[PDB]
C-alpha cells in the first residue's frame with residue numbers, strides 16, 4: 001500500500017494513482033511575488049461556533065480529528081467559494097525536523113507542519129460524492145512554525161499517547177477548532193487536489209498567510225506517533241508530507 005517511505009512514497013504513487021501526474025495536483029509552491037491580488041475575492045467566512053468534534057483516529061498516515069457533518073454546524077463559505085462547505089475532519093502533515101513538514105511552501109520555505117481543515121460542498125450531499133467533483137472540497141491550510149505553544153492545540157497533543165498506532169481511535173468530543181486559527185484570515189487560493197491518494201482533483205485550496213506558532217514540545221509529540229499498527233516494529237510517524245508539484249496551467253490568487 002501507499003505511504004511515505006522510500007519504497008511506497010510520493011515518487012511511487014503515480015503507479016496506482018496516475019492522476020498523480022495530472023493538471024491540478026497539490027501541494028504547490030506559493031511564489032508570493034507572482035500570486036496576484038484579486039480584489040474580487042471575498043473575506044473568508046469561517047463559522048466554527050457550533051462545531052461538534054467526535055473522535056480522533058490514527059489512520060496510519062496522520063491523525064484525523066473528526067466532526068459531525070450531518071448538519072450545518074461548522075462551515076466554510078465566502079472567499080473564492082460559491083456555496084457552503086461543511087467541516088468533516090482536520091489533520092496535519094509534519095516533519096522529522098523543524099525545517100521540513102509542510103506540504104505547501106512559500107517562496108520555497110518549508111514550515112514545520114501544516115494543518116488541513118477539510119470541508120465538503122453541501123450541494124453534493126456527502127463527502128464521497130463531493131470528492132468526485134472539481135469543486136467538491138475546500139481545504140483550509142494553515143502553516144505551523146516552532147516557537148511559542150499554541151494553547152488550543154494542547155488537547156490534541158495530550159490525547160496522542162492513546163492513539164499511538166495505526167487503527168487506534170479515542171473519543172474527542174468538545175474540541176473547538178477555532179483555537180487552531182491565526183489572527184488573520186488573509187489567504188492564497190488555487191485549484192488543486194488531495195495531497196494523498198486517491199489524489200483526486202476536487203479541492204479549492206485556501207492557504208492562510210499567517211502561520212500559527214506551536215512549541216517544540218508540541219511537535220515533538222506529533223513525532224512520537226507511529227505509522228505501524230500495535231505489535232508491529234515501530235515506524236515513527238514523521239515526514240508525512242507530499243513535496244510541491246508542478247503548478248502547470250494555474251494561477252494562485254491572493255486575498256490581500
Ligand SMILES: CSc1nc(Cl)c(C=O)c(Nc2ccc(S(N)(=O)=O)cc2)n1
Pocket residue numbers: 059061116118131139193194195196197198
Ligand atoms: C489519507 S487516506 C484517504 N483515503 C481516501 Cl479514500 C480519501 C478520500 O477522499 C482521503 N481523503 C483525503 C482528504 C483530504 C486530504 S488533504 N491532505 O488534501 O487535506 C487528503 C486525503 N484520504
Ligand SMILES: [Zn+2]
Pocket residue numbers: 091092093116195
Ligand atoms: Zn492534508
